[PDB]
């Protein structure tokens, strides 16, 4: 049921924090996981580069919404923030990552030019999960207590009987991971418009 075990064996309360207003010197980045039948997710991550601490500050998750509807639901916080997004092509062909990113850009999101990668061009999920777990354990990854869809997924994220990530209920998790991977594109809060 939880396979060979949960991926993040960390008490939720250790990574949960009270919401606060973003300081001018924090960096801000958004991320998107695409989805129609599956939920899509749009998240916002704050990065204190001085303390090197990450805050998952905003989360929106919803099935069967268009890009126009997503923008209407999150534009209050998503406006002008660069957006990381997945998909180097293949999902039984047709318009995957790049065509969907266009629909989202047209809807008003500041979509980043390229799909989410680490600095070296890689996109390993395993690598992202390891780095995120380290941050959690070191007290350097926090989630606002108002971002409940993160915790819902966090609780269920597990590996199958052979040790592979079971890729379900992981839209907010994926988005969070994309924002983290692309953190070099995060913009300083005071330079946004402030
Ligand atoms: Mg789909
Ligand atoms: Mg998904």
From Swiss-Prot:
Binding residues for Mg(2+): 33, 171
Region of interest (Nuclease activity), ranges: 24-194
Domain of life: Viruses
Subunit structure and binding partners: Interacts with the terminase small subunit; the active complex is composed of dimer of terminase large subunits and a nonamer ring of terminase small subunits. Interacts with the portal protein; this interaction allows the packaging of viral DNA.
Domain notes: The ATPase region is in the N-terminus, whereas the nuclease region is in the C-terminus.
Task of the protein: The terminase large subunit acts as an ATP driven molecular motor necessary for viral DNA translocation into empty capsids and as an endonuclease that cuts the viral genome to initiate and to end a packaging reaction. The terminase lies at a unique vertex of the procapsid and is composed of two subunits, a small terminase subunit involved in viral DNA recognition (packaging 'pac' sequence), and a large terminase subunit possessing endonucleolytic and ATPase activities. Both terminase subunits heterooligomerize and are docked on the portal protein to form the packaging machine.
Family that this chain belongs to: Belongs to the Lederbergvirus large terminase family.
Listed name of the protein: Terminase, large subunit
Organism expressing this protein natively: Salmonella phage P22 (Bacteriophage P22)
Full-protein residues shown: 289 to 482 of 499
């Amino acid at each position: 049921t939880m396979g060979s075990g949960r991926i993040f064996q960390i008490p939720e309360e250790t990574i949960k924090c009270q919401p606060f207003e973003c300081p001018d010197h924090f960096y801000v980045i958004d991320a998107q996981d695409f989805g129609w039948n599956h939920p899509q997710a749009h998240i916002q991550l704050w990065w204190d580069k001085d303390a090197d601490v990450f805050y998952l500050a905003r989360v929106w998750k919803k099935s069967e919404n268009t890009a126009v509807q997503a923008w209407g639901a999150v534009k209050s916080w998503a406006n002008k923030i660069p957006v990381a997004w997945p998909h180097d092509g293949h999902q039984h062909e047709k318009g995957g990552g790049e065509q969907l990113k266009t629909q989202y850009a047209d809807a008003g999101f500041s979509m980043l030019p390229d799909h989410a990668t680490f600095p070296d061009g890689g996109n390993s999920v395993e690598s992202g999960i390891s780095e995120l777990r380290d941050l959690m354990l070191e007290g350097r990854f926090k989630v606002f207590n108002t971002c409940e869809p993160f915790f819902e997924e966090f609780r269920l994220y597990h590996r199958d009987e052979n040790g592979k990530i079971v890729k379900t209920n992981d839209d907010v998790l994926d988005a969070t991971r994309y924002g983290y991977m692309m953190r070099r594109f995060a913009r300083m809060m005071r330079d946004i418009r402030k």
